Write a protein that binds this ligand. Structure first.
Ligand code: CL
Ligand code: CL
Ligand code: CL
Ligand code: CL
Ligand code: CL
Ligand code: MG
Length: 263
């Protein structure tokens, strides 16, 4: 809607950075609104949904078990690992790692899951196989968050990842059980959801994953809608801003508020 576009523009002005935006009809994939949809942005932790999609595809294929226990060490622990730092001695199952990666954005959990699939290149190969020609993962956490100027590593486009999310959450790419488990991880309550959840009316559905990185990188992917059911996918990314984190968050949140207001 034009009111959302204007909020996107305001965010670019206030933040001193580009903002990419797309909104798809969930059922049809029709593009309802877009701004810089084919430009590249760091995915940051939004990739963790794609990662868990790849893990679930392996589960469906009999190549992984959700119950398999993953044992790791102190030196595997990286920054922002609130769940995995509590399981050095006992390990975590694949299921537990996906829950942590998505609901808690746990960085080490994502690295361990990357190991289970064979790494960034294997995630990228899965994405190419499902028809995403743009998204690429090159590095693990935390380096994938760097957001360096003119660096194509660890990027997507709003249009690419929106389509990929739709493929994961709808249709038959994943079995019903895996699709529902991915959904459920994304729906689960989170500690703080400034970008879309904080202002979202009660009773609306949202399955989301946010991301934050260096050099102003911030964004979110989500399926959401009224009456308990998702009906749209939205993707919002920005990178380059040196405004405060609070200002970045507020500008993105205002885009979301407008999408909801003018739904
Ligand atoms: Cl545009
Ligand atoms: Cl574009
Ligand atoms: Cl134990
Ligand atoms: Cl493994
Ligand atoms: Cl959020
Ligand atoms: Mg809830």
């Amino acid at each position: 809607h034009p009111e959302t576009l204007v909020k996107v523009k305001d965010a670019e002005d206030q933040l001193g950075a580009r903002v990419g935006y797309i909104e798809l009809d969930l059922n049809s994939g029709k593009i309802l609104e877009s701004f810089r949809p084919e430009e590249r942005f760091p995915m940051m932790s939004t990739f963790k949904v794609l990662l868990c999609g790849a893990v679930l595809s392996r589960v469906d294929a009999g190549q992984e078990q959700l119950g398999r226990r993953i044992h790791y060490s102190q030196n595997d622990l990286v920054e922002y690992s609130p769940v995995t730092e509590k399981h050095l001695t006992d390990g975590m199952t694949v299921r537990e790692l996906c829950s942590a990666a998505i609901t808690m954005s746990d960085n080490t959990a994502a690295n361990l899951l990357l190991t289970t699939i064979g790494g960034p290149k294997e995630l990228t190969d899965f994405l190419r196989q499902i028809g995403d020609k743009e998204t690429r993962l090159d590095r693990i956490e935390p380096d994938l968050n760097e957001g360096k100027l003119g660096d194509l590593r660890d990027t997507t486009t709003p249009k690419a990842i929106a389509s990929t999310l739709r493929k994961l959450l709808t249709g038959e790419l994943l079995t019903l059980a895996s699709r529902q488990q991915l959904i459920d991880w994304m729906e689960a309550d989170k500690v703080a959801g400034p970008l879309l959840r904080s202002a979202l009316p009660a009773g609306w559905f949202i399955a989301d994953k946010s991301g934050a990185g260096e050099r102003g990188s911030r964004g979110i992917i989500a399926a959401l809608g009224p009456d308990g059911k998702p009906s749209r996918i939205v993707v919002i990314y920005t990178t380059g801003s040196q405004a405060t984190m609070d200002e970045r968050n507020r500008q993105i949140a205002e885009i979301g508020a407008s999408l909801i207001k003018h739904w």
